[PDB]
């Protein structure tokens, strides 16, 4: 049994300040095209000189040093859900943003036309809702896909709100073409930190956009 | 206190990451009308349960323990220049904003007609620039007027930019009706932090909007 069970899943009704998870998926994601790491804090992270409405430096934390050097100084694209609480490169990183993973090679990884993907959503067992998600990458991180999914469901199904969720449990499952499938829980532990919760993107898991499937499971009450 | 000394003024040409001062005065200030503090980290601060983009909890550092309990149970108005780096580090509040002072009692501090105040500006000794500023508060913090003067000079005379300033030095001089006058240096020391610099507002100095005057002195590179 690789897939979770009722008891394994976190209940949104026990979470304090679940609005923090809400603000992460409701707001825009950090996206950048064809950039190169300019610095490094620890051996398993990389820093980029890119900018967004609230930052001019972005620090991504990857699986380990091997993955960091694998992408260091190499031309890559960034797609990630960022946080600010407890993020900085010292008392000399006034406007930094942090994320985990969300890194993909830029060269030869784009599609002419976006590749739409169906997201099968089940609620209390009943698979009663399906929608489309799209990407421009041949190899897209699970994080990019995940965000687009939770963003859509946050706007259209109140998966998240500045407060409670109308759902009790929920989780996203990715089914790779031949590799093993994996999942992420939509809700954190009762007392959590944005930084700890986002570690789920730390492994930088990437997928083949043309052959991967996505499944969401929600429970109400 | 006594007017600044030519050699006592910080030079923007020496500042590292001056764009950090830019973002402070370019973006919107934090303002709230009828609110009572809700919590308190240290005895000299007050936490408010108000929000804006990026934050839903605001912490203001006042002069001392005495000033905080003075407003603790009061409905007040807020007007401050907020920062986030090294703001509220307690993994139980991940969306806090921080300002210094900027507090005034709400009750009976409102004018039916806004008070215009003439800000006179000198550039290299020549007083060649005048422009109005306004407030609704009978008693207004120096911080509010200071922010309005910089935002205006930032968007109209290039006081700050996402890079260097066209001015090497510059200070704002407040001249209360009877009390001693005082000033604030528009620029920080070479290496600094938004948190440190903003301490110029920690005393929460408030002026009479009807009898106070403002003077600005800048020099070109
Ligand atoms: Zn690209
Ligand atoms: Zn008021």
UniProtKB/Swiss-Prot annotation, chains A, B:
The keyword Hydrolase does not apply. GO terms for cellular component: extracellular region. GO terms for molecular function: toxin activity. The keyword Transport does not apply. Disulfide bonds join 87-98. Keywords: Disulfide bond, Signal, Toxin, Virulence. Binds to major histocompatibility complex class II beta chain. This toxin is coded by bacteriophage T12. Causative agent of the symptoms associated with scarlet fever, have been associated with streptococcal toxic shock-like disease and may play a role in the early events of rheumatic fever. Belongs to the staphylococcal/streptococcal toxin family. This is Exotoxin type A.
């Amino acid at each position: 049994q690789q897939d979770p069970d009722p008891s394994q899943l976190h209940r949104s009704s026990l979470v304090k300040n679940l609005q923090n998870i809400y603000f992460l998926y409701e707001g825009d994601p950090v996206t950048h095209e064809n950039v190169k790491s300019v610095d490094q804090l620890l051996s398993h992270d990389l820093i980029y000189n890119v900018s967004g409405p609230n930052y001019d430096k972005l620090k991504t934390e990857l699986k380990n040093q091997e993955m960091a050097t694998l992408f260091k100084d190499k031309n890559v694209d960034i797609y990630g859900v960022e946080y600010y609480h407890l993020c900085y490169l010292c008392e000399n990183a006034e406007r930094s943003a942090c994320i985990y993973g969300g890194v993909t090679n830029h060269e030869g990884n784009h599609l002419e036309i976006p590749k739409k993907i169906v997201v099968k959503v089940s609620i209390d067992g009943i698979q009663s809702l399906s929608f489309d998600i799209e990407t421009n990458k041949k190899m897209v991180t699970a994080q990019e896909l995940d965000y687009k999914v939770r963003k859509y469901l946050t706007d259209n199904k109140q998966l998240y709100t500045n407060g409670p969720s109308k759902y009790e449990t929920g989780y996203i499952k990715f089914i790779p073409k031949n590799k093993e499938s994996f999942w992420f829980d939509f809700f954190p532990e009762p007392e959590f930190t944005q930084s700890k919760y986002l570690m789920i993107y730390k492994d930088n898991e990437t997928l083949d956009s043309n052959t991967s499937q996505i499944e969401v499971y929600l429970t109400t009450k």
